[model samples]
Every structure is written in structure tokens, then in C-alpha cells.
Target: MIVKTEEELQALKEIGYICAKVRNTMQAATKPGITTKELDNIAKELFEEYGAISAPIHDENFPGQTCISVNEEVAHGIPSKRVIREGDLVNIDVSALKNGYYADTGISFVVGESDDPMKQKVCDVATMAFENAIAKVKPGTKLSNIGKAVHNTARQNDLKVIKNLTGHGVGLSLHEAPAHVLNYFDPKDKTLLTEGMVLAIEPFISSNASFVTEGKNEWAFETSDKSFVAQIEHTVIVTKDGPILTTKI
Candidate 1:
């Protein structure tokens, strides 16, 4: 969605703070012995305290207050009895709505005593991919250029990107027009980034597979080859100066 006024920008920022807060809180709460459901509870309490409604729950009646994916689970892994242990990779995705505005954000992290160099390397790549892609976000920049940056960065790091997964326009709703902000360059997409255009810039980096498929349960996304993957995201707004990160700690 395009920001047309100061009020709109302020609304986005307000919910953006809540989204970032929940994500950060969950990140800190992540540790050995914590259940994914417990993490969802923590986020639920925060959303209530802040007078915010979880976008996923409010938007889709999602099974959980927050989406927590561990290891091979790439996205939308429902919170359950599954317990997190040391060295497990966790991905928490949080989005919320406040005063009619919406925001989304996510992070991939290791629980504890992480010694897998490959896992740490892929996680770093996901973050750096987001950094590299966001740097190219500005008024008049080609939409495909953002994907180009992320994809190239992943390749340079000896990692693959989940092509089926994508970031998208966000603000007025959970998802909006100019969707499919791909992680890989698509010459067919000529959409140009514009000032006031808010988007969720996420890059899903995998150790192997470049594609993902729906799990049997129909909620989570998994790599076609069951390879480990990592993801990082932030909601941002394009501006003359560059992208303004709305969801930041």
C-alpha cells in the first residue's frame, strides 16, 4: 500500500513497533526447553498488552498466535508441543494490526550452543541478503533489482534461495498489490519501487533446495529436498533517501 499522508505513515509505524517488539521478544525467549507454543503465548500476551491483534490470526484464523518454524520447517509452522533444543534453528514470523494498520517481520536464529558452521553461515546469508536487497530500495528503483541483489548475494555465499517464497506489499492489509517481491531476479516483472510504497522484504536462504512445497498439514512450507533453510525479513517503506525500516529493534 502507498502512504498518502502523515497519518498513514504514523499508523504504519505504530503497528510496525508492535510487530518488531513481538519478534524481538520471541527471539529473546527462544532457548532450550521452550516449546513453540510457549513462545506463541508470550507473543499473544504482548499483543493483548499493546492493544494489537495478530495479523495472521486476525487475517486468516491462523492456528497460532505466531508462526514458529524450526529447522527444516521453512514457514508457517504452527506452535505446538514441539520443544526447542540446543542447536536447533528457529524462525519466528510476527505480524500485527493496530489502529487499522498492519506490519510484518521475521528472524532466523539458533537456540543455543550452535556449532554447525553451515547452519550459522546460511543464517548469516539470509540476513545479509535482506541487507543487500533493502539497500537497493528507493524511489525509481526497479523491483527486479531488489531480487537480483538478494539472489546474487545468496549465490556468492554458496547458498540457494527459495524461489517460490516471496516478500510482498504490506500496510493496509496483511498482503497487498505489487505482491510477489521475488527473492530471485525476474525480468518479466517491471514494477518500479515508488516513494511511500511499503513492503516486507524477506529472503529465504537454503543450504540446498531452491524450491519449497507445502507440508501435508497444509500450514507450513518445507524444502523440496528437506534441506535446512533460514530467513530474515523487515517491513520497509521506499523513500528518496532509501528504504525506511519500519520493523526494527
Candidate 2:
């Protein structure tokens, strides 16, 4: 969705901040023995207090207030009784609507003390890819450049990207046009970023597998080869100067 008015931009900011706060708070509380279900409830209560609604639960009938993907899970891992371990790679994706506007954001991190190099690699590459993708966002910039930046970063780091999962347009709704904000460049994609456009620019990177498969009975994605995956995301608005990371604190 395009920010056609000041009110629209403000609304988007409000929701974007809300999503970020909930996600950040949840991550801070993610420790050993904490259940993903418990973390999800935290977000549910916060959304209620802020008069915001979980986009997944309300619009998509997704069973969780927020997506909590564990290690090997690409995205959309549902909240459950499974306990979070100290060395587990956890990803929390948050998207919500308030005052008729929507925003999305996500982050991946290791739960606690760990020296696993693979986990750190996934996190670094994911972060680099997200930043590179955002740096390409500008009015008149080719949309595929965003994907190219992500792809290039992953390749430079000798890692793979989750091509099936992607970022997307968000503002008026949880998902919008230009939904296929890929992690790999697509030469056929000729769309351009335009001013006032709001998008959830996310990068899903993997240690080995370049694609993922869905888990049955779960609104989640998992690497087919059990390869570790990481994702970083933010909601931003395109502008002449650059992009405003609405979800950034």
C-alpha cells in the first residue's frame, strides 16, 4: 500500500512501532524453558492493550498471535507447548493492524549462551541481507535490486537463501501487491519501488538449503534438509531521500 496521505503514514508508523515493541519484548523474554505459546500470549495481551489486532489471527485465521519459528523452521512456526532451549535458534515474526493500518517485522536469534558458529553465521548473513535489501529501496529503484542485494550478500557469505519465503507489501493490509519480495533476484520482475510505498523488507537466509517445505498442521516452513535458517525483517516506507524504517526503534 502507498502512503497517499499524512494520516496514512502516521497510522502505519503507529502500527509499525507497536509490532516492533511486541517483537522486541518477546525476544528479550525468550530464554531457556520458555514456551513459544507463552511468548505468543505476551504479544496477544500487548496487542489488546494497544488496541491492535494480530493480522494473522484476524485476517488469515492463523492460530498464533505471532509466528515463532524454531531452528530448521523457515517461517510461520506456530506457538505451541514446545520449550525454547538455551542454544536454540528462534525466530519471532510479528504483524498487526491498528486504526486501519498494518505493519510487519521479524527477527531471528539464538536463545542463550552458545558458541555455535553456524547459528552466528545465519544471523550475520540474515542481517546483512536485510540491510542490503533496505539500502536498495528508493523511488524508481528496480524492485528486483532488493532481491539481488539479499542474494548477493548470502552468496558472498557462502550461504544459501530461502527462495520460497519472501518479504511483501504491507500497510493497508497484512499483504499487498508486489508480494513476491524474493530473497533471490528474478530477472522477470520489473516492478519499481515508488515513493510513499510501504513494504516489509525481510531476508530469509539458510546455512545450506535454498528452499523450504511447509509443515503439515502448522502454519510454518522448514528446511527440507534440516538446514538452519534465519530471518530479519522490518517495515519501511520508500522516499526520495531513502527509506524510513518505521519499525526500527
Candidate 3:
């Protein structure tokens, strides 16, 4: 969606903050013995207080207020009684709609405490990859360069980019045009980044497989090799100066 007016920009910004706040709260609430459903409840309360609707639930009828994925679970893992534990990596994804605008964001956190170097490294790389991609955003930049920036960062960190899971254009709805925001560079895609284009830039970095497979439940996606994966995402609007990150916490 293009942000053509100050009113549109402000509304998007409001929803962006709502989404980020819910994601941040969920991340902070992640602790050993807490259930994903309980984490989602916290999100529900926030949405209510903010007068926003859960994008997943409002748009897709998702079972949870937020997407709570863990470890091998790549995305859209259903909230349930499965308990979170120390040494676990929790991925909290939040998207919400407010005043007819939508915003999306996600983050991965290590539950309780973790001194594992590799775990820390992958999380760092995932975030760095998103930053790298966003750093290259500006009017007239090639869209494919975003993917290249992400892929380059993952390679340097000795991690794989989940090829199947990509970011997308988001604002007017949960997903929109320029939807296939590939994690790997696609030279064939010649689309240029333009001012006012809102995008969700997320990189799914994995310790093993580059591909993910759908789970039996049909909502969850997991690494094909059953290895650890980490992801980070933000919603932003492209501009002449650079991308304005809307989903900032």
C-alpha cells in the first residue's frame, strides 16, 4: 500500500505501534512454564485496550491472537498448552488493524536464559539480516537488492535463508502487492522500490534447511531438516530518504 497522505501515514503508524507493542509484550512475557495460549491472552488484552483487532484473527480467523512459534516451528504455530521451557527459542509474531490500517512485525527470543553461542549467533544474524535489507531501501532501489542483502548476511553467519517463507507488502490488509518478498535474490525481478511502498521485511535464518514444510495442522511451517531457525521482521514504508520503520518498539 502506498502512503500518499499524512492521514494514511499516521493511521499506519498507529497500527504499527500496536502490533509492535503486542509483539514486545509477548516477548517479555516469554518464560519457562508459560503456555503460548497465555502469551496470546496478553496480546488479546493489549488489542482490546488499544481498540485494535488482531490481523490474523480478523483477516484469516487464526486461532490465536498472535502467532507463537517455537524452535523448529517456523511460522504460524498455533497457541496451545505446550509449555515453553528454558533453552527454547520463541518466535512471537503480531499483526493488528486499527482505523482501517494494518501493520505486522515479529521477533524471536530465547526463553528464560541461554548461554548457547550458536543460539545467540543465529538470533543476532536474523536481526542483522533484516537491518541489512532495510538499510538498502530507498526510492529507485531495485527490489531484488533487498533479498540479496538478506542472503548475504545469512551466508556470512553460516546460516540458510528459508526460501519458502518470505516477507510481503502490508498496510491495507494482512498481505498485498509486491507480496513475494523473496529472501534470496531474484535477478528476474526488476521491480524498483518506490516511495510510499509499505513492506514487511523479514528474514528466516536457519541453522540447517533452506526449505520449510507445512505441518499436519496446516497452519504451522517447520524447517524440513528439523533444525533450529530464527526470524525477525519489521514493517516499514519506503521513502526518498530511506525506509521509515513503522513497527518500532
Error of 2 at 237 (Å): 0.5
What is the C-alpha lDDT profile of model 2 across 1-249, one tens digit per residue? 988898888898899899999999999999999999999999999999999999999889999999999987878899999899978999999999998899899999997766677987899899999888888889999999998999999999999998888888988888897777888889988899999988888898899988888775557788767888999999999999889988899
Tens-digit lDDT string for candidate 3 (1-249)? 999999999999999988888888888888998999999999999999999999999999999999999987979999999899998888899999999999999998787666676666778899999989998999999889989998999999888889989999999998998978889999899998888999998898888888899874889988766777888989999998778888995
| Poorly placed runs, candidate 3 (over 4 Å) | 114-116
Residue 20, candidate 3: alpha-carbon lDDT: 85
Candidate 2, residue 135: the lDDT equals: 81
Off by over 4 Å in 2: none
lDDT scores of the candidates, listed in order: 0.90, 0.90, 0.89
Cα lDDT tens digits, model 1, 134-168, are 88888998999989999999999989999999999
Per-model TM-score, in order, reads 0.97, 0.97, 0.97
Residue pairs whose backbone atoms clash in candidate 3:
none
Q: Rank the candidate models, highest lDDT first.
A: 1, 2, 3
